[PDB]
Each structure stands twice: as structure tokens, then as C-alpha cells.
Amino acid sequence: VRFPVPDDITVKQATEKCGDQAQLSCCNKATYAGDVTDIDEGILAGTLKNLIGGGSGTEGLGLFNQCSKLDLQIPIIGIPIQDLVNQKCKQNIACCQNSPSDASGSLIGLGLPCIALGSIL
């Protein structure tokens, strides 16, 4: 992971940070679009930009493979538990678009389009 997620970010906070259409996912393999030439970062950035809203961090954007989604813990279930993403994950933590579109989604199923949360800070 080139852009690590702050250890003090809970799974809930991380989800809020990446937007309502994004969920944290931990992938064992990561391909960044700017690191490879056969992938157009501009296309991926276009769709992922919707999750960024306002900011810049395409340097952590690309295709993520061998990934598993992180399930949200219950926000304050009586006990004030602060479930930190780095505490349950030892894999590359990224935020993935939970919107199946036929543009930059269906015809590029070589991996999961996601962005490293550390890139959007």
C-alpha cells in the first residue's frame, strides 16, 4: 500500500470519508492505473471522482484484485467500541464504488475499481 490509511480511522469513519456509495475493502494485490500504461487512469478517475467529491488522489487509484469487503460494525452498540480499519485489516485498504455501471465497470472486470483511502486523506 503506497498510501496507508490513518490508524485512528474507524471502519465507520472510513466509510463516511469515502462517501455513502463506497465501502472499505481489503485487497492482497494492487495495480495502480498510473503505474501501468495499458490502463487509462482518466476513465477510472472519472467514475471514482464521484466518491472523492472534492479533492485529488488518483495516485492510489486503479484495479484491485483478490479483495474482500469489510463489514460495518454497529455504531456505538451500547459499548463505545472504536473499530479501527488498520486493527482488523493487514491488507491494502481501499474504498470501492458500490455502483455497478456499464461505463467503466462492466467491460473492465479485470479487477475491482477502488481507491486507497490514504490518497484522499
Total count of residues recorded for the chain: 121
How far is the CA of 41 from the CAs of 4, 19, 20, 33, 55, in angstroms? 20, 20, 23, 5, 16
Q: Do residues 12 and 83 lie in contact, with contact meaning Cβ atoms separated by under 8 Å?
A: yes
d(CA 67, CA 111): 9
Q: Which amino acid does the sequence have at 83? A: D
Choose among 113, 6, 118, 110: nearest CA to 49.
113
